[PDB]
Design a protein around this ligand. Structure first.
Ligand SMILES: *[C@@H]1O[C@H](CO)[C@@H](O)[C@H](O)[C@H]1NC(C)=O
Ligand SMILES: [Tb+3]
Ligand SMILES: [Tb+3]
Ligand SMILES: [Tb+3]
Ligand SMILES: [Tb+3]
Ligand SMILES: [Tb+3]
Ligand SMILES: [Tb+3]
Length: 393
């Protein structure tokens, strides 16, 4: 991921240069892993947002029978006594009843004598839609009408789950369970490589993730891998070799993640626009103003250049760029900028990369006062809900 800030490991030489040697950095996260090569490829991730096929459409099926004894009371009365009781359905009956219902027909649906009793016994099955949930980590099928919370059968062969009422069974709408793990999209990403080695990818939004520390995880039949940050994707030759502890969970794929991801990626773009735009006005106004060198800082860790102005001239040195995690790790004192081991003595109020000592003695870094990439980086961290197992226990 992107750091908050970057800072030279050490600063030694400070050689001079002309404004036409100003380079804007390309900020490739994958470079710090040693992979500067980006070839397209295609990977599987969860569908975005709602997963209509983690839910399983089905129907309860209860068997009733209504008896009606129509006796003549001997008063000359004609009296009718009703009894209602239950019975247990067979799966094949329930299916035929359901199919009968989905298309209109005749669905659901007495002589006196003087001295005869008459008993009509009607044997209905009632069919109400009932949705039940599935654990995509491993195909079991949970609901609170099932007696242990878990279906009595198990994917791919569920003729019927057993419910808590001996007279009611649950059948699934599609006895095949053929749609019931279509929860995947195929997206197009850009894989970052070094010859053969695969170090990470940018997903369909442009957001880079590293493969380092990624365990293997099979989700609802498809064997993918779990990326450190928690998200899950499957593609052909992962080079991942450590199965996950079942403790581990993946994350959902909600839309605002994908949205906020895209915000991050246009943020990286806009700093690279703003660096060329600055470097243009630098060469076409032929006036370089120290405030603005801030734009040439290598946003990613790695090797690069650093820039200042002294003795009137403009000048550079070649550095390794440490990741900076907390502002306080480089600003321990007021007025102190921790480069390597000592503070950085500013000459007539300037240090490198546009960092100055303001008139109050404080070390002003422009990125520190407002950075839209950093504010967005936090929202992403906050849109990440882990996809948990079913709660029914
Ligand atoms: C691959 O890694 C080697 C070793 O550091 C490096 O010399 C080479 O430039 C790399 N190739 C890339 C990043 O395409
Ligand atoms: Tb080093
Ligand atoms: Tb009787
Ligand atoms: Tb929104
Ligand atoms: Tb929106
Ligand atoms: Tb331009
Ligand atoms: Tb301080």
């Amino acid at each position: 991921e992107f750091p908050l800030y970057t800072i030279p490991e050490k600063i030694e030489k400070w050689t001079p240069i002309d404004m036409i040697h100003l380079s804007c950095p390309n900020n490739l996260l994958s470079e710090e892993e040693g992979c500067n090569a980006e070839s397209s490829f295609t990977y599987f991730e969860l569908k975005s947002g709602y997963l209509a096929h983690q839910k399983v459409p089905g129907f309860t099926c209860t068997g009733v029978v209504n008896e009606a004894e129509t006796y003549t009371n001997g008063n000359g009365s004609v009296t009718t006594t009703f009894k209602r009781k239950h019975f247990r359905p067979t799966v094949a009956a329930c299916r035929d009843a359901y199919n009968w219902k989905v298309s209109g027909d005749p669905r659901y649906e007495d002589s006196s004598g003087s001295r005869t009793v008459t008993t009509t016994k009607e044997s209905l099955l009632i069919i109400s839609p009932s949705i039940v949930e599935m654990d995509i980590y491993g195909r079991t099928l949970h609901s609170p009408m099932f007696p242990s919370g878990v279906c009595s059968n198990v994917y791919p062969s569920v003729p019927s789950c057993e419910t808590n009422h001996d007279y009611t069974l649950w059948l699934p709408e599609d006895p095949s369970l053929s749609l019931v793990c279509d929860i995947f999209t195929s997206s197009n990403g850009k894989k970052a490589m070094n010859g053969s080695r695969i170090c990470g990818f940018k997903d369909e939004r442009g957001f880079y993730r590293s493969l380092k520390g990624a365990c293997k995880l099979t989700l609802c039949g498809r064997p993918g891998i779990r990326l450190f940050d928690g998200t899950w994707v499957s593609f052909t030759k992962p080079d991942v070799h450590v199965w996950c502890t079942p403790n581990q969970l993946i994350n959902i794929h909600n839309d605002r993640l994908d949205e906020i991801e895209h915000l991050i990626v246009e943020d990286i773009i806009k700093k690279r626009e703003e660096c060329l735009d600055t470097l243009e006005t630098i060469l076409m106004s032929q006036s370089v103003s120290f405030r603005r060198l801030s734009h040439f800082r290598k946003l990613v860790p790695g090797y690069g250049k650093a820039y200042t102005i002294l003795n009137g001239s403009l000048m550079e040195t070649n550095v390794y760029y440490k990741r900076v995690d907390k502002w306080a790790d480089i600003l321990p004192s007021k007025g102190c900028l921790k480069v390597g081991q000592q503070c950085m003595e500013p000459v007539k109020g300037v240090l490198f990369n546009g960092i100055i000592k303001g008139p109050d003695g404080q070390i002003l870094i422009p990125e520190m006062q407002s950075e839209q990439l950093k504010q967005h980086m936090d929202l992403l961290k906050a849109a990440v809900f882990p996809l948990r197992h079913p709660l029914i226990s």
